[PDB]
Amino acid sequence: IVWVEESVSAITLYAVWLPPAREYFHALVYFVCRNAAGEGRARFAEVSVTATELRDFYGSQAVVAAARAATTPAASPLEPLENPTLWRALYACVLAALERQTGPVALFAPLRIGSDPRTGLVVKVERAWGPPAAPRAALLVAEANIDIDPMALAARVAEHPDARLAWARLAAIRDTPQCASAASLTVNITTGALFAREYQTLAFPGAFGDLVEVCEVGLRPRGHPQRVTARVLLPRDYDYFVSFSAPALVALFRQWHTTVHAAPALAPVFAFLGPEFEVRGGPVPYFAVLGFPGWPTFTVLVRGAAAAYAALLGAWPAVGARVVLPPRAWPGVASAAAGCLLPAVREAVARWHPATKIIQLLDPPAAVGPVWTARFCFPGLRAQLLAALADLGGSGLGRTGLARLDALVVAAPSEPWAGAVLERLVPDTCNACPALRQLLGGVMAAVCLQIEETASSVKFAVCGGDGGAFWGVFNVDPQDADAASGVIEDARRAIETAVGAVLRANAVRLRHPLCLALEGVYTHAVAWSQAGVWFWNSRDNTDHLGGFPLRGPAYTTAAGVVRDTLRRVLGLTDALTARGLMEDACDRLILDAFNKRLDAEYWSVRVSPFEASDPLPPTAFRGGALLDAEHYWRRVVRSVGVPVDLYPRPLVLPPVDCAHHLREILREIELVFTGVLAGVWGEGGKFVYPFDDKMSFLFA
Amino acid sequence: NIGEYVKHNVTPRETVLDGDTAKAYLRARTYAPGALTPAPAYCGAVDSATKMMGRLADAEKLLVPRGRLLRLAATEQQGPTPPAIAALIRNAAVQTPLPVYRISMVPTGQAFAALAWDDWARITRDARLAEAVVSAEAHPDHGALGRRLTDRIRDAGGQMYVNRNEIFNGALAITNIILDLDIALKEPVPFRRLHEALGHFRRGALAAVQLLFPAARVDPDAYPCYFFKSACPVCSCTDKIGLRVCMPVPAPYVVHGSLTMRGVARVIQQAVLLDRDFVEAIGSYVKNFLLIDTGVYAHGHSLRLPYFAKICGRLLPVFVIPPACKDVPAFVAAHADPRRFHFHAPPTREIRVLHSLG
């Protein structure tokens, strides 16, 4: 049972079979292990997963439906599209069985690796000491020309009216695998050697031996009554790729698979996941290798994806919220954490409803005159609270996922990659369990009632927010003088220490002690919606605007105009002169929009897969390899809608409907302006801009 | 009066564009600065109705990133590459906006012609007086000189050269006031009487033009009004006497809209019907009094251009020389520049766009 001090680089699923049994299955995992010198080696481990653990990571399906995902070992190449959460489940459950049976496992980190020479399988893993092998990076540029018939690519969206077209593209490539066979492909894998490859048709004719090493290892898995040989591709001098045609990578790796696994031996899984694999897309890009090749492909800095990989064992974002804790083991932690809280806080956690008025705020629309406004925040308080409460409910379910969460929480303040992961994971685990919605609502309610209670005593008056982000007026300061930094400092310390004391008093223990940020000191503020607030500092003409949509470039120019307009408008300290300044700003905006009356990309808005939008022109269905970049947002101009990205460049368009787009923008600017006029000068008059009367003609 | 009529029955809306937006507007909504400058031969898109529908269907097959008298009138843009019309015209140095024409064909049928440039001498050489002939015509009174100068005068891709109607494109601005006179008359009319009646048309209409365009130095003496009378100098014309009056829009203005120009025409109509001199000089010949078809400015509608017959009165000039004109050779020569008789021509700091009258 030999121990080698090494450093796993990737963990990837090789095979998934069921022994002479009925209610559980096994998996065989592939390890990319490297010595202190970098010298690569290839080891394996075996794991068992029960029906219940699978259902837990799925959120109930059946293990015969996760072993007929041993049709992935052929040329049926996009098997996850059939059932994506099944694969997210199977991979998260294997990564839990592996730590629960082989022990702690940490990508890129010094490790102690056992074995069983009778069998060759890794049996145990532990930590160790040594200055580990630096992950080397390989660059990858790849392009492919898949010939998908663009009438088949429209039938899919005929069935799925919101389908992102990277998904329709993949679904077609799934319904006729042979499209990836006759497909041009160019690849250029730089590895500090060089691997270019022409492929006029990818089924026909640097060295593929200086890029990978083909290794065959003999294994005797307990799940098999026979010795079975695993053939792998061990990277040399690189540990991951950095790159996006998802079908380009799919067909490339599918060629590699068909070639390597030609002769008699055992055949890997070949499964990939990405946002292109869901019908409605998914906001963030990633390409999850969880199968044949054996190592990742970070589709981008890059130290960010590398570190996220290493910290969450590579399952993020592939597996989703299953990184931290199974889906159907969240109700237990929710209830358990709920029980540990003080009964006042528990009544809060039980009567949380999303739309509640917990703190009295400035009722919109209203403005705050020359005061000392301050705008605070607790950086990432929802992630800290989720981690802390998951701990506090731990005894309702192991804790390795929660340790990953805790690493992401201690790392967020200093590294932004951790912050990104948190901002994407906290929402999505709540989406997987609503009792988490309510627990977080309750504890945030308690954290708002304090802050209110403390602000009563620290010359602060909460004027708006949510409890991790809030702002208010120091209605004791002299509207002047340098004795304003001192009071804001005292207030920030008092609220930091009070919120910390409250969270302790409920047995919620925070990874790293709260810091109350001061995100700016202002002197005027106007509030026009729930989310809409503009701030301004008269001492130094600095501002902040929040609540305006930024749906395209037109909207960022508009937001700049609204900010400059509000600066002048609050420089007037009647209402009519304000309206003059506002209509002057809108006039100048429409004229400068006329100068950009041809720039289609500027007037394009981004439309989610949920907000109903313009239908697709059939001409967009044959945009070729640009549909494959459409995973979340569709960028549309308009009257008939144009998806400006499903067409080659440069566009050849009728005039862009600048009146439609300026009408939208003017409606939002008019919300802002009605708010400011009502709030500061008490006008009941909704601000309206005459567009159809003046300036309509410019776009007729 | 007329001040009263344009005080009650017209509501100007103007928008003072300025600086570079002025140049952009002019270039964007008028014909290109070479669409009406002459050229050795035409680069255009001329065919019958059916072949034009086909050639459009074939330019659609190369204009796949978006989307027959709306569609031709639609096909305008430029960018920093060749415009979208170039798929139909089939050059790469086309420039837009550019004219679109409706062409009556013997024996029947209609053809259309969107052309980036044409040979305007081939059209208007057998009507052009030599600079010397003018400068030696020696005739002091301007009624006299105008009348004598008027006395002097003398396949789809070929039929465009005898019948050519210009299509109003409401996308575009209007830089000329193209009136379409259709005087119906009971007893025939001499030509000195008509010429003096037109000298009284211009004066009243210029008063109307000055009321409608207040910040414009439209001197009612030297402001050019270009008259073309259809041939039928003996008039010889019984029943109907077709004129065509073209006035530059005054200096800082441009007109936008079909309804705006319908309004301008109707105001000019009422102003010239309120001139007591005009209706004496022309009355007792003229049955009706509706001298101006204000409904010819609608999008998609066509007006026969000067120097073109009908399928045959060539609209040939009647030089109603301005009182107190300054450079008579130039005024005579302008009855030949196409810019002075197309709706959407280039104008010859700020501009104001009269986009509504009511």
Task: Report yes or no: A601 at the B interface, CB cutoff 8 Å.
Answer: no
**C-alpha angle with apex A527: A522 to A533, nearest 5 degrees?**
60
A607 membership: H or E segment, kind and range: strand A605-607
Please tell me the distance in Å from B176's CA to the nearest CA on chain A: 18
What tokens does A580 get?
Answer: 């003059």
Which residues 614-633 of chain A have a CB within 8 Å of chain B? 617, 619
**A245: how many CB neighbours lie within 10 A of its CB?**
22
Looking up tokens 């837009």, which residue turns up?
B96
**B324: how many CB neighbours lie within 10 A of its CB?**
10
Task: Report yes or no: A227 at the B interface, CB cutoff 8 Å.
Answer: no
- Encoded amino acid at A660, one letter: H
Would you call B67 and A594 a contact, using CB atoms and an 8 Å cutoff?
A: no
Please tell me the distance in Å from A695's CA to the nearest CA on chain B: 8
**A501: how many CB neighbours lie within 10 A of its CB?**
11
Beta strands in A371-447 (DSSP E): 373-377
Looking up tokens 């025939």, which residue turns up?
B188
Those residues whose C-beta lies under 8 Å from the C-beta of residue A343, and which sit 6 or more positions away, are none
Task: Report yes or no: A591 at the B interface, CB cutoff 8 Å.
Answer: yes
Instruction: Return phi, psi of residue A385, to 5°.
Output: -70, -40
What tokens does B108 get?
Answer: 């029947």
Q: Which residues of B112-124 are buried (b: 16+ CB within 10 A; e: fewer)?
A: bbbbbbbebeebb
Burial-class residue B149 by CB neighbours within 10 Å (0-12, 13-18, 19+): buried
Burial-class residue B64 by CB neighbours within 10 Å (0-12, 13-18, 19+): middle
What tokens does A587 get?
Answer: 């006039």
Q: Is A430 left (phi over 0), alpha (psi -120 to 50) or beta?
A: alpha
Sequence ranges of the domains in chain B: 5-29+123-356
Give the chain B residue nearest A651 (alpha carbons). B65
- Encoded amino acid at A468, one letter: G
Beta strands in chain B (DSSP E): 13-17, 43-48, 100-104, 110-117, 165-167, 176-179, 182-184, 226-230, 240-248, 253-255, 302-304, 315-318, 351-356
What tokens does B59 get?
Answer: 């330019």
Compute, in degrees rounded to 10, the torsion defined by CA atoms A444, A446, A447, A451.
Answer: 140
β-strand pairing of A533-537 with A524-527? antiparallel
Say what angle helices A152-159 and A165-175 make with each other, to 10 degrees: 120
A90 membership: H or E segment, kind and range: helix A84-101
- Encoded amino acid at B337, one letter: D
Residue A388: strand pairing partners: none
**A145: how many CB neighbours lie within 10 A of its CB?**
17
- Residue A611 CA to residue A526 CA, distance in Å, equals 29
Please, which experimental method was used? cryo-EM
Which among A10, A42, A93 is positioned nearest to A296, based on CA atoms?
A: A10
Please tell me the distance in Å from A565's CA to the nearest CA on chain B: 21
Which among A601, A593, A583 is positioned nearest to A669, based on CA atoms?
A: A583
Say what angle helices A343-350 and A330-340 make with each other, to 10 degrees: 140
In DSSP notation, A100-149 reads: HHT----TTS-EEE---TTTT-B--EEE--S------EEEEEEEEE----
Residues in chain B with CB shorter than 8 Å from the CB of A650 are 79, 81
Q: State the resolution, in angstroms.
A: 3.0
Residues in chain A with CB shorter than 8 Å from the CB of B22 are none
Chosen CATH of A327-533 out of 1.20.1070, 3.90.1600, 3.40.50, 1.10.3470: 3.90.1600
Please tell me the distance in Å from B318's CA to the nearest CA on chain A: 36
Q: What sign for the dihedral angle of Cα A297, A300, A303, A307?
A: negative
What is the SS3 assignment for A693?
coil
Instruction: Tell me which DSSP letter residue B90 carries.
Output: -
- Residue A562 CA to residue A687 CA, distance in Å, equals 14
CA A45 to chain centre: 30
Would you call A652 and B13 a contact, using CB atoms and an 8 Å cutoff?
A: no
What is the SS3 assignment for B320?
coil
- Closest Cβ opposite residue B74 in set A650, A651, A654: A654
Cis peptide before A150 (omega within 30 of 0): no
- Residue B10 CA to residue B259 CA, distance in Å, equals 12
Q: Which of A604, A644, A698 to mutate to test the interface with B (most CBs of B within 10 A)?
A: A698
CA B5 to chain centre: 25
Residue B353: strand pairing partners: B15, B254
Which among A346, A532, A407 is positioned nearest to A106, based on CA atoms?
A: A407
Residues in chain A with CB shorter than 8 Å from the CB of B78 are 598
Q: Is A313 left (phi over 0), alpha (psi -120 to 50) or beta?
A: left
Would you call B15 and A594 a contact, using CB atoms and an 8 Å cutoff?
A: no
A561 membership: H or E segment, kind and range: helix A553-570
- Residue A130 CA to residue A110 CA, distance in Å, equals 6
What tokens does A504 get?
Answer: 């302790």
Those residues whose C-beta lies under 8 Å from the C-beta of residue A100, and which sit 6 or more positions away, are A398
- Residue A326 CA to residue A224 CA, distance in Å, equals 29
Please tell me the distance in Å from B60's CA to the nearest CA on chain A: 11
Give the chain A residue nearest B14 (alpha carbons). A694
Would you call A694 and B21 a contact, using CB atoms and an 8 Å cutoff?
A: no
Give the chain B residue nearest A645 (alpha carbons). B65
Q: What sign for the dihedral angle of Cα B255, B258, B263, B268?
A: positive
- Residue B228 CA to residue B245 CA, distance in Å, equals 7
Please tell me the distance in Å from B171's CA to the nearest CA on chain A: 6
Would you call A594 and B24 a contact, using CB atoms and an 8 Å cutoff?
A: yes
Q: Where are the alpha helices (DSSP H) in A433-552?
A: 434-455, 485-505
- Encoded amino acid at A359, one letter: I
Those residues whose C-beta lies under 8 Å from the C-beta of residue A612, and which sit 6 or more positions away, are none
Which among A562, A590, A568 is positioned nearest to A672, based on CA atoms?
A: A562
Task: Give the residue range(s) of CATH 3.90.1600 domains in chain A.
Answer: 327-533
